[PDB]
Amino acid sequence: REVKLLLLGAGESGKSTIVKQMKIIHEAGYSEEECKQYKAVVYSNTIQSIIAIIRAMGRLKIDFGDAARADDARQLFVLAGAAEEGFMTAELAGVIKRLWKDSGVQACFNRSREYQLNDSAAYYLNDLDRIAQPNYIPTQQDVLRTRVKTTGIVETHFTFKDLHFKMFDVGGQRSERKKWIHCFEGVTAIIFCVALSDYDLVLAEDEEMNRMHESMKLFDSICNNKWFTDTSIILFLNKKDLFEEKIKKSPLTICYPEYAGSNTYEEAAAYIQCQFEDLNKRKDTKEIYTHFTCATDTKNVQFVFDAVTDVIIKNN
Ligand SMILES: Nc1nc2c(ncn2[C@@H]2O[C@H](COP(=O)(O)OP(=O)(O)NP(=O)(O)O)[C@@H](O)[C@H]2O)c(=O)[nH]1
Ligand SMILES: [Mg+2]
Numbered sequence: 001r002e003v004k005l006l007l008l009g010a011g012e013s014g015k016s017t018i019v020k021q022m023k024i025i026h027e028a029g030y031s032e033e034e035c036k037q038y039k040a041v042v043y044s045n046t047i048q049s050i051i052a053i054i055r056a057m058g059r060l061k062i063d064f065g066d067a068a069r070a071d072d073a074r075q076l077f078v079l080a081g082a083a084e085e086g087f088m089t090a091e092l093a094g095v096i097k098r099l100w101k102d103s104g105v106q107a108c109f110n111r112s113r114e115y116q117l118n119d120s121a122a123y124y125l126n127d128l129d130r131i132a133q134p135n136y137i138p139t140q141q142d143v144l145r146t147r148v149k150t151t152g153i154v155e156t157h158f159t160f161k162d163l164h165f166k167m168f169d170v171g172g173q174r175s176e177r178k179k180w181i182h183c184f185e186g187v188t189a190i191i192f193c194v195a196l197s198d199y200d201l202v203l204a205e206d207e208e209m210n211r212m213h214e215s216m217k218l219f220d221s222i223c224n225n226k227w228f229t230d231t232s233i234i235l236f237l238n239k240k241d242l243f244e245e246k247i248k249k250s251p252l253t254i255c256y257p258e259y260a261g262s263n264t265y266e267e268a269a270a271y272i273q274c275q276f277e278d279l280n281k282r283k284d285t286k287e288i289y290t291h292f293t294c295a296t297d298t299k300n301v302q303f304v305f306d307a308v309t310d311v312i313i314k315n316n
Pocket of ligand 2: 015016017148149150170171172
């Protein structure tokens with residue numbers, strides 16, 4: 001009846017978002033009090049995103065589309081402190097809206113692989129009127145879209161198909177990887193997450209290292225670890241939604257110079273799957289259970305998790 005699941009993968013791969021989904025799917029979702037706890041995270045993420053774009057404009061030498069935005073940028077810093085405390089005035093919202101709508105700001109936003117920016121920047125910025133309303137309470141999707149890097153070990157429990165799951169989540173940033181070993185005992189299954197959309201990005205800790213290459217190294221280490229011979233290895237090729245949009249405009253050759261396929265979702269997605277699955281040194285004795293996911297999409301995760309659960313019931 002007992003099942004231990006361990007979520008692994010590089011930073012920003014979506015591990016913690018999968019954990020949040022278990023609450024929505026298996027429990028009754030986030031309560032009003034719990035949602036309110038995320039209000040300051042949504043506001044902080046929103047302000048940090050617009051600030052990151054404005055910072056990049058200086059570094060890349062991009063001017064504002066309309067000159068009047070310079071004073072809005074000044075007012076952004078004067079007012080930014082409140083959001084961080086869970087407050088969002090109409091004045092601050094207006095400043096952020098005008099900045100977000102500016103052509104120069106948009107030009108910089110569209111060059112985000114050149115700096116570090118939250119995947120949920122557009123999600124919150126495009127929905128400013130809603131999140132800025134007085135008495136705003138985060139929705140389940142707003143909670144799922146929040147971003148806070150994991151430190152330490154998060155343990156979550158839930159019952160599904162008469163099984164009591166004990167799910168462990170850890171940080172994927174370089175500084176937190178030394179902690180993965182504390183979770184290595186009695187693992188029924190490992191869910192290794194990979195952000196498909198990372199193929200053209202670089203690590204925050206190092207701008208010379210391709211994020212997908214880093215992910216591959218980690219997977220090769222985990223999948224081939226003799227300690228995990230009897231542990232089910234589940235591979236979540238995550239952020240499939242972002243990958244579908246990006247493949248249309250950013251060459252996969254940035255990551256795999258030898259890629260000869262077209263810039264289409266199906267071909268490119270299958271190529272990446274093969275690149276990771278080929279790292280398995282024991283293809284005849286060890287199976288990898290791969291699924292393409294969008295961690296923020298509850299219905300997608302529900303069906304994928306139901307499928308993963310059967311594999312676990314049947315094998316472990
Ligand atoms: N659009 C989209 N965003 C996603 C998806 N999966 C996760 N995110 C977003 O990506 C950000 C990072 O996700 P998170 O779960 O925190 O990543 P992590 O692997 O736990 N990072 P760490 O290792 O640092 O704890 C969050 O803002 C989350 O909402 C996805 O499939 N699509
Ligand atoms: Mg996390």
